[PDB]
Design a protein around this motif. Structure first.
Motif, PDB file in Angstrom:
ATOM      1  N   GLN B   5       0.787  -1.239   0.000  1.00  0.00           N
ATOM      2  CA  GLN B   5       0.000   0.000   0.000  1.00  0.00           C
ATOM      3  C   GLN B   5       0.820   1.291   0.000  1.00  0.00           C
ATOM      4  OE1 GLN B   5      -4.021   0.179   2.178  1.00  0.00           O
ATOM      5  NE2 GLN B   5      -3.104   2.139   2.775  1.00  0.00           N
ATOM      6  N   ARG B   8       1.816   2.147  -3.482  1.00  0.00           N
ATOM      7  CA  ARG B   8       0.701   2.610  -4.301  1.00  0.00           C
ATOM      8  C   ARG B   8       0.490   4.104  -4.045  1.00  0.00           C
ATOM      9  NH1 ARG B   8      -1.420  -3.002  -3.739  1.00  0.00           N
ATOM     10  NH2 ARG B   8      -1.199  -3.814  -5.861  1.00  0.00           N
ATOM     11  N   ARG B   9       0.800   4.536  -2.819  1.00  0.00           N
ATOM     12  CA  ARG B   9       0.692   5.928  -2.374  1.00  0.00           C
ATOM     13  C   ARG B   9       1.452   6.921  -3.241  1.00  0.00           C
ATOM     14  NH1 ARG B   9       3.317   7.569   2.409  1.00  0.00           N
ATOM     15  NH2 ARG B   9       2.549   9.647   1.835  1.00  0.00           N
ATOM     16  N   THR B  13      -2.264   8.758  -7.137  1.00  0.00           N
ATOM     17  CA  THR B  13      -3.580   8.616  -7.749  1.00  0.00           C
ATOM     18  C   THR B  13      -4.659   9.280  -6.887  1.00  0.00           C
ATOM     19  OG1 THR B  13      -3.728   6.383  -6.811  1.00  0.00           O
ATOM     20  CG2 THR B  13      -3.019   6.596  -9.102  1.00  0.00           C
ATOM     21  N   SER B  14      -5.862   9.415  -7.447  1.00  0.00           N
ATOM     22  CA  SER B  14      -6.996  10.058  -6.778  1.00  0.00           C
ATOM     23  C   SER B  14      -7.221   9.653  -5.331  1.00  0.00           C
ATOM     24  CB  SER B  14      -8.277   9.860  -7.586  1.00  0.00           C
ATOM     25  OG  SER B  14      -9.302  10.722  -7.132  1.00  0.00           O
ATOM     26  N   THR B  15      -7.261   8.346  -5.076  1.00  0.00           N
ATOM     27  CA  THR B  15      -7.489   7.787  -3.743  1.00  0.00           C
ATOM     28  C   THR B  15      -6.511   8.301  -2.673  1.00  0.00           C
ATOM     29  OG1 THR B  15      -8.312   5.746  -4.802  1.00  0.00           O
ATOM     30  CG2 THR B  15      -7.838   5.622  -2.480  1.00  0.00           C
ATOM     31  N   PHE B  16      -5.276   8.567  -3.093  1.00  0.00           N
ATOM     32  CA  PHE B  16      -4.231   9.012  -2.179  1.00  0.00           C
ATOM     33  C   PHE B  16      -3.998  10.513  -2.138  1.00  0.00           C
ATOM     34  CE2 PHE B  16      -3.210   4.706  -1.078  1.00  0.00           C
ATOM     35  CZ  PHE B  16      -3.357   3.940  -2.255  1.00  0.00           C
ATOM     36  N   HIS B 176     -14.295   9.030   9.303  1.00  0.00           N
ATOM     37  CA  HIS B 176     -14.581   8.999   7.865  1.00  0.00           C
ATOM     38  C   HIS B 176     -14.640  10.405   7.273  1.00  0.00           C
ATOM     39  CE1 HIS B 176     -16.694   7.869   4.117  1.00  0.00           C
ATOM     40  NE2 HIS B 176     -17.488   8.889   4.385  1.00  0.00           N
ATOM     41  N   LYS B 180     -11.946  12.303   4.676  1.00  0.00           N
ATOM     42  CA  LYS B 180     -12.413  12.687   3.349  1.00  0.00           C
ATOM     43  C   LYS B 180     -11.882  14.097   3.002  1.00  0.00           C
ATOM     44  CE  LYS B 180     -16.462  11.969   0.480  1.00  0.00           C
ATOM     45  NZ  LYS B 180     -17.515  10.925   0.308  1.00  0.00           N
ATOM     46  N   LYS B 185      -5.708   7.446   2.704  1.00  0.00           N
ATOM     47  CA  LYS B 185      -6.543   6.296   2.411  1.00  0.00           C
ATOM     48  C   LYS B 185      -6.915   5.759   3.802  1.00  0.00           C
ATOM     49  CE  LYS B 185      -8.438   2.574   1.080  1.00  0.00           C
ATOM     50  NZ  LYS B 185      -9.701   2.483   0.309  1.00  0.00           N
TER      51      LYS B 185
END
Ligand SMILES: COc1ccc(C[C@H]2NC[C@H](O)[C@H]2OC(C)=O)cc1
Ligand SMILES: [Cl-]
Ligand SMILES: [Cl-]
Ligand SMILES: [Cl-]
Ligand SMILES: [K+]
Ligand SMILES: [Mg+2]
Ligand SMILES: [Mg+2]
Ligand SMILES: [Mg+2]
Ligand SMILES: [Mg+2]
Ligand SMILES: [Mg+2]
Ligand SMILES: [Mg+2]
Ligand SMILES: [Mg+2]
Ligand SMILES: [Mg+2]
Ligand SMILES: [Mg+2]
Ligand SMILES: [Mg+2]
Ligand SMILES: [Mg+2]
Ligand SMILES: [Mg+2]
Ligand SMILES: [Mg+2]
Ligand SMILES: [Mg+2]
Ligand SMILES: [Mg+2]
Ligand SMILES: [Mg+2]
Ligand SMILES: [Mg+2]
Ligand SMILES: [Mg+2]
Ligand SMILES: [Mg+2]
Ligand SMILES: [Mg+2]
Ligand SMILES: [Mg+2]
Ligand SMILES: [Mg+2]
Ligand SMILES: [Mg+2]
Ligand SMILES: [Mg+2]
Ligand SMILES: [Mg+2]
Ligand SMILES: [Mg+2]
Ligand SMILES: [Mg+2]
Ligand SMILES: [Mg+2]
Ligand SMILES: [Mg+2]
Ligand SMILES: [Mg+2]
Ligand SMILES: [Mg+2]
Ligand SMILES: [Mg+2]
Ligand SMILES: [Mg+2]
Ligand code: NA
Ligand code: NA
Ligand code: NA
Ligand code: NA
Ligand code: NA
Ligand code: NA
Ligand code: NA
Ligand code: NA
Ligand code: NA
Ligand code: NA
Ligand code: NA
Ligand code: NA
Ligand code: NA
Ligand code: NA
Ligand code: NA
Ligand code: NA
Ligand SMILES: [Sr+2]
Ligand SMILES: [Sr+2]
Ligand SMILES: [Sr+2]
Ligand SMILES: [Sr+2]
Ligand SMILES: [Sr+2]
Ligand SMILES: [Sr+2]
Ligand SMILES: [Sr+2]
Ligand SMILES: [Sr+2]
Ligand SMILES: [Sr+2]
Ligand SMILES: [Sr+2]
Ligand SMILES: [Sr+2]
Ligand SMILES: [Sr+2]
Ligand SMILES: [Sr+2]
Ligand SMILES: [Sr+2]
Ligand SMILES: [Sr+2]
Ligand SMILES: [Sr+2]
Ligand SMILES: [Sr+2]
Ligand SMILES: [Sr+2]
Ligand SMILES: [Sr+2]
Ligand SMILES: [Sr+2]
Ligand SMILES: [Sr+2]
Ligand SMILES: [Sr+2]
Ligand SMILES: [Sr+2]
Ligand SMILES: [Sr+2]
Ligand SMILES: [Sr+2]
Ligand SMILES: [Sr+2]
Ligand SMILES: [Sr+2]
Ligand SMILES: [Sr+2]
Ligand SMILES: [Sr+2]
Ligand SMILES: [Sr+2]
Ligand SMILES: [Sr+2]
Ligand SMILES: [Sr+2]
Ligand SMILES: [Sr+2]
Ligand SMILES: [Sr+2]
Ligand SMILES: [Sr+2]
Ligand SMILES: [Sr+2]
Ligand SMILES: [Sr+2]
Ligand SMILES: [Sr+2]
Ligand SMILES: [Sr+2]
Ligand SMILES: [Sr+2]
Ligand SMILES: [Sr+2]
Ligand SMILES: [Sr+2]
Ligand SMILES: [Sr+2]
Lengths: 56, 237, 73
Positions: B5, B8-9, B13-16, B176, B180, B185
């Motif tokens: 993980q 991937r950070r 990308t968008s998620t990170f 949460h 956001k 993540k």
RNA sequence: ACGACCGUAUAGUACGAGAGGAACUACGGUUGGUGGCCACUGGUGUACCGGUUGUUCGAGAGAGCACGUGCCGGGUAGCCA
RNA sequence: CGAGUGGCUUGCUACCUCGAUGUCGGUUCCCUCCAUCCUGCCCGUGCAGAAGCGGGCAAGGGUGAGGUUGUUCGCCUAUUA
RNA sequence: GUCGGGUGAGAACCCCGACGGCCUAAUGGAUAAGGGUUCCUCAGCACUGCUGAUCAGCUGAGGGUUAGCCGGUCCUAAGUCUCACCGCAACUCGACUGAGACGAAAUGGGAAACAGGUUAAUAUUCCUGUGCCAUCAUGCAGUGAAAGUUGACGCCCUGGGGUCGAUCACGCCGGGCAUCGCCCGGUCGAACCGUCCAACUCCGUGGAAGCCGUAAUGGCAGGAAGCGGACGAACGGCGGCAUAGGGAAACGUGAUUCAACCUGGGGCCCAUGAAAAGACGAGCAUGAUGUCCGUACCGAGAACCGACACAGGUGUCCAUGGCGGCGAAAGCCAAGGCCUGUCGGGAGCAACCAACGUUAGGGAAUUCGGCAAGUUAGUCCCGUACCUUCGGAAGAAGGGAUGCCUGCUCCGGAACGGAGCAGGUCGCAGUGACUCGGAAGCUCGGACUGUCUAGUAACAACAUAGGUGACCGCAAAUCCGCAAGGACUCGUACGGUCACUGAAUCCUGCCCAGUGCAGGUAUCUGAACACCUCGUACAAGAGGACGAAGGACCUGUCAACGGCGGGGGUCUUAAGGUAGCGUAGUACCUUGCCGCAUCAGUAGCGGCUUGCAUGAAUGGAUUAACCAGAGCUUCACUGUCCCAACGUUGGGCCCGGUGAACUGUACAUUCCAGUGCGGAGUCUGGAGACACCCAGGGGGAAGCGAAGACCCUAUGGAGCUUUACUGCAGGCUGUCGCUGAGGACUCUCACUCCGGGAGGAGGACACCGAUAGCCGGGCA
RNA sequence: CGUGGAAGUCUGUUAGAGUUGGUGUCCUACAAUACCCUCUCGUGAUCUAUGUGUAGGGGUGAAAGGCCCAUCGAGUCCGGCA
């Protein structure tokens, strides 16, 4: 939900369309790139040696 | 195996990524030539989505509307001054040379004119201690004695929004909502709960790490997990 | 004050929320006048209903122990 | 396509110090199995008759629908145990 | 100690099936075996009687309901010829 | 669906009427996507249509889509592309930075259109009437003009204004019904122009020391109420529009509750809820211009995706039609749609099967297990235990009531709102159908809501708050890229990265020997470059000196990997298992022993417990609440069972029409035995056997279906692991180049970073290029 | 006592989402994951349409080796390749 028949019902999105350059239904209207002739990606026409057998 | 993980950070990308398009302002100090004759009135007190602390809207003499890193006690109507000959009042920005010793300071610069790097989070403060012609010793929120250039600007007072860490999140939903608004993540799945393919601590018939948790500094990305270059572990001893 | 949490979460989590929200909902003395009319507008944002003075304070307290130390020097 | 058991008389008898305690035979019944039948009891009986809720046909009268009877009560023939 | 019969247990072998003969236990439905648990007929008795013990002929019929356990097995209860 | 009838060579299914049904967030109405002519007309039946067809989404031929004001077009969103710059061996590749462009058709923003009429088929597009916007031109007014406002905004509660609708009252028009006199429908009329203004805000007056005010919060001498005034809303009221339109006619009036729409008050955030174009600001007349693209139809149990006219899948608006009731619930019924979830005919219609009703007595005896079914049920009153985190447990449990009719009371402005009282009265039954919990207890697990194996696992697994440890001061730690560069980051220790544990409560013992990490280090070991010796007219090469990281060695560290025994009254290898819990989802022995409970209890619960092989964030114990989680007990209930019966609907069976597939070496009427590669319809011996056909339940064809998933074998494959072999990234470290002046040091001029700049910080280091040593399942 | 109306709060086939049991129906299907009853959630870590991003030893993953167009312990196509 099954990946087969019930997941096919959502397929009403238009992606591949008739290309301005080659005439094939391969112009991805979201990517603005043709998967057949490479229009939108390259000035040179998309062609590869693997499209035929090595000694042909 | 597969990339972990943490790998991937970096790809960004968008998620990170942080929701930058939802952020208000990059809270930096104003640029003055010399003379100090730059002051302003506080118009509004806004919420900053980037730091969960409040920020103050100030309108300057030369018609410039900018958001500033709000210290505690700053309200609408109050006049703040920025420059060398600025008044030693909470909410004013002047270089460390002009600020007296033993006074709590915030939004401290690393290199003069950078706009502020240190002591910016909710309720924290840097403590100015020693003076010289060459060095201004500041004690940062971590307890570290940072030797800085006396020409580095800083704002007087502690940062606003103090004691945020005091109240528990209670439920997952509250976490949460905070997450956001950040570049993280969430939720966190333990490596020990993953497969061998996914993490160095993955696999096994039961959940436990496969080797000791204290990893070397020299370890490559994909292996550097657990307790990174720990000098010690545990509470006792 | 944590009756909204029901039989969930446990003592410490809902005792600390009840204590913090009790001190937050209290009547606070204003820096402009002297009236007990300060209410919370959001995270760290405080305002007096009398003179309309909108100011910065702690997240749940209008004044933190560290914010009172600034006045001393 | 019948198998087996209990009971009564034999008999508180034979046997035995006593305690205890048979049989042949003749009877009555039960159980399991078997074949058949419905007078009787029981079930069913969206044949039928009644009561009644909601709604629709203006009310009444008389009806439709509510899962293949709305629900409730009674139930003939037949089929059944 | 010696001699055997069976092919229910177990073990042994690797003959048959790996281009597949669907597992255990249970259930349901049919047939069978006798090394007989009951029932019929018998012999002996440390057979008075009653109740037994042991043996012989005999496979017509019967051999049931339950508590734990997936259990087969087995333990347990009350009935039972 | 049925009876008549129509057309036709031909009619169960094409059309008309009647009767009878089906659909009510859809089976109705409008649409997005997607389809693409499927739309309408005429002519047809070779094809397609689960049968037939005169019909058709079929075949053929024609026809059909009309816009200044409805979309597009314009704007900007996440984000995308192009050019430049830079990288790359190179590009159709690649991140940044600049500029430009692109990016919203239901459903983001947005100049302006309504009503009626018309066609076989279009329609805010055509036609009639009326209206409106923008631009430009002419004329008049105006010199203001850009500050500001708007566009433009989250979640929860709520007041006020108010239209459609629905309902009530009464009147008019029309229809229906016919013991009554009730029932149904209609009673119309826009955009636009004009006008009215509640809420909010503010001003004057006033002068409250307790008053003003709200559904609630609240307000005030820093000036309350009252009074006057400025600003100021609706898709609303009112007038025009309208001797427009529409209706056979009348061509209403009031009211209540009020979607839309307008306007306020309150509360919440470790969450803060777009932007831009544009508009307003900023007048009026007359006139001209307003191009280009879309426009048919379907929008689904036949027009879309799923090979099909597929029981699947597929977004938006109509959420206010009537009764009912809490209700966008059931059931029933309108408007509208349909009889195309498209084959029919016949048999009291058998067996058997699917769905289902009812079953006497017993009542879980059924079974791994109450699986399946059933029981309970709405509303009001009374009443309610253990335990508990004081929230909850709880609808605990248990008990009573419940209809209709007559006349009334109370709350409220009132409802066609609600709460009650008295009398009368019917049934077996009054939440009469429908709608509608069965209840209680013990134990295990996970705290809770949440997540998951699209397609055999929903769980105790994952997540979670909470607890804890680790790294990092930002030119950081961590991570991505070959590079140029980049995420974290509009961030800065109350941060965020990397891990572990998993709410709360009570706690969390001992061990640093091994392994890991980290710090230190006299001495030892430790590569290459340079340097020294030997060697060589040089070179290879041999040795030496110096010695970085690393290692040896030493120390720290277990909420770091882990460990917590044998023996005896220490030994391995550091310690030698503390609180607790314990026959455990961990206990082999084992159905452990005792007790509870039962006729009987490998179950369950309690106690004991020497624990084959429990035990403390590999977290231990405990625990209220929660649960489609695992086990057990009780009350209730019942066709699960004793033990089955009868019935209902669709099939099954017979007839018309349509019309596959699986499977097939051959032969084949078998049975009992035997034999055979030891599991034969076919061989051997006997037995039996006239042929064909219908229905049946599946004994056999080691039945059909699949080159066995198990197992082994192959110098087969792949995923995964590591102190396997060998290597490759990466990190650390020395050395050389960039690189400069005067075994420790000063400086500034390269170079790097900060600063808009001036200039500041750093500095021959760092970065980068090259090489050397160490670490190096991150990867091959 | 009232007012107030909080909640990853409760009941709920509201819409919508999900998928526990029947190991029912189907299993040459209506369907290459369907049907029916039952069941869970239904103001939130909620559901959903459209637009947009991440790409193959790479994504994405509240972690099941789940998912990346009926394809996943390494997608699909063609080529290496006979
Ligand atoms: C109980 O464990 C078992 C083991 C094997 C088999 C199958 C085999 N038995 C007969 C043939 O060898 C094979 O048949 C097949 C494969 O269909 C069944 C059960
Ligand atoms: Cl956080
Ligand atoms: Cl359109
Ligand atoms: Cl209000
Ligand atoms: K086999
Ligand atoms: Mg900033
Ligand atoms: Mg995010
Ligand atoms: Mg986790
Ligand atoms: Mg796993
Ligand atoms: Mg690994
Ligand atoms: Mg664990
Ligand atoms: Mg663990
Ligand atoms: Mg077989
Ligand atoms: Mg014998
Ligand atoms: Mg016999
Ligand atoms: Mg025709
Ligand atoms: Mg039309
Ligand atoms: Mg059809
Ligand atoms: Mg009964
Ligand atoms: Mg049994
Ligand atoms: Mg059940
Ligand atoms: Mg009254
Ligand atoms: Mg147990
Ligand atoms: Mg859970
Ligand atoms: Mg867990
Ligand atoms: Mg599954
Ligand atoms: Mg579940
Ligand atoms: Mg945590
Ligand atoms: Mg933490
Ligand atoms: Mg025990
Ligand atoms: Mg410990
Ligand atoms: Mg094979
Ligand atoms: Mg295997
Ligand atoms: Mg291999
Ligand atoms: Mg820079
Ligand atoms: Mg490997
Ligand atoms: Mg999407
Ligand atoms: Mg696994
Ligand atoms: Na033998
Ligand atoms: Na069996
Ligand atoms: Na016998
Ligand atoms: Na038994
Ligand atoms: Na038809
Ligand atoms: Na008006
Ligand atoms: Na929930
Ligand atoms: Na150790
Ligand atoms: Na242990
Ligand atoms: Na039944
Ligand atoms: Na057969
Ligand atoms: Na594999
Ligand atoms: Na209260
Ligand atoms: Na289901
Ligand atoms: Na759940
Ligand atoms: Na791949
Ligand atoms: Sr479905
Ligand atoms: Sr779609
Ligand atoms: Sr391109
Ligand atoms: Sr080419
Ligand atoms: Sr900055
Ligand atoms: Sr800057
Ligand atoms: Sr592991
Ligand atoms: Sr300790
Ligand atoms: Sr007798
Ligand atoms: Sr006697
Ligand atoms: Sr009926
Ligand atoms: Sr009932
Ligand atoms: Sr014999
Ligand atoms: Sr006998
Ligand atoms: Sr056995
Ligand atoms: Sr045994
Ligand atoms: Sr439509
Ligand atoms: Sr014909
Ligand atoms: Sr048509
Ligand atoms: Sr555009
Ligand atoms: Sr729009
Ligand atoms: Sr109102
Ligand atoms: Sr149309
Ligand atoms: Sr559908
Ligand atoms: Sr109708
Ligand atoms: Sr047809
Ligand atoms: Sr009856
Ligand atoms: Sr039972
Ligand atoms: Sr039983
Ligand atoms: Sr009751
Ligand atoms: Sr626990
Ligand atoms: Sr799923
Ligand atoms: Sr805890
Ligand atoms: Sr150590
Ligand atoms: Sr002990
Ligand atoms: Sr058959
Ligand atoms: Sr809820
Ligand atoms: Sr619910
Ligand atoms: Sr199952
Ligand atoms: Sr079916
Ligand atoms: Sr199936
Ligand atoms: Sr069922
Ligand atoms: Sr090939």
């Amino acid at each position: 939900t099954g990946a087969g028949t019930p997941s096919q019902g959502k397929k009403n999105t238009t992606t591949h369309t008739k290309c301005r350059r080659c005439g094939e239904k391969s112009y991805h209207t979201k990517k603005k790139v043709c998967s057949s002739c490479g229009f939108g990606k390259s000035a040179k026409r998309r062609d590869y040696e693997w499209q035929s057998k090595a000694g042909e | 195996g597969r990339r972990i993980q943490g790998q991937r950070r970096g790809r960004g990308t968008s998620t990170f990524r942080a929701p930058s398009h939802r952020y208000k302002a990059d809270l930096e100090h104003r640029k003055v030539e010399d003379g100090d004759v730059i002051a302003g009135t506080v118009v509004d007190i806004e919420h900053d989505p980037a730091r969960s602390a409040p920020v103050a809207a100030v309108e300057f003499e030369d018609g410039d509307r900018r958001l500033i890193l709000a210290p505690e006690g700053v309200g609408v109507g109050d006049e703040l001054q920025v420059g060398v000959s600025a008044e030693i009042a909470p909410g004013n920005t002047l270089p460390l040379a002009e600020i007296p010793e033993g006074v709590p300071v915030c939004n401290v610069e690393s290199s003069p004119g950078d706009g502020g790097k240190f002591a910016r989070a909710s309720g924290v403060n840097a403590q100015l201690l020693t003076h010289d012609r060459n060095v201004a010793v500041v004690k940062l929120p971590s307890g570290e004695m940072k030797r800085l250039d006396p020409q580095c600007r800083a704002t007087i007072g502690v940062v606003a929004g103090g004691g945020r860490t005091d109240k528990p999140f209670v439920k997952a939903g509250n976490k949460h909502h905070k997450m956001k608004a950040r570049g993280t993540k969430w939720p966190n799945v333990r490596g020990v709960a993953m497969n061998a393919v996914d993490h160095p601590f993955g696999g096994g018939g039961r959940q436990h790490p496969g080797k000791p948790k204290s990893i070397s500094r020299n370890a490559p990305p994909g292996r550097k997990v657990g307790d990174i270059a720990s000098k010690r572990t545990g509470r006792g001893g | 004050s944590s009756g909204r949490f029901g039989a969930r979460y446990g003592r410490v989590s809902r005792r600390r929320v009840a204590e913090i929200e009790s001190e937050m909902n209290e009547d606070h003395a204003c820096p402009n006048c002297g009236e007990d009319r300060v209410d919370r507008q959001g995270t760290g944002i405080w305002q007096c209903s009398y003179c309309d003075y909108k100011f910065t304070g702690g997240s749940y307290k209008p004044e933190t122990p560290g914010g009172k130390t600034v006045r001393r020097s």
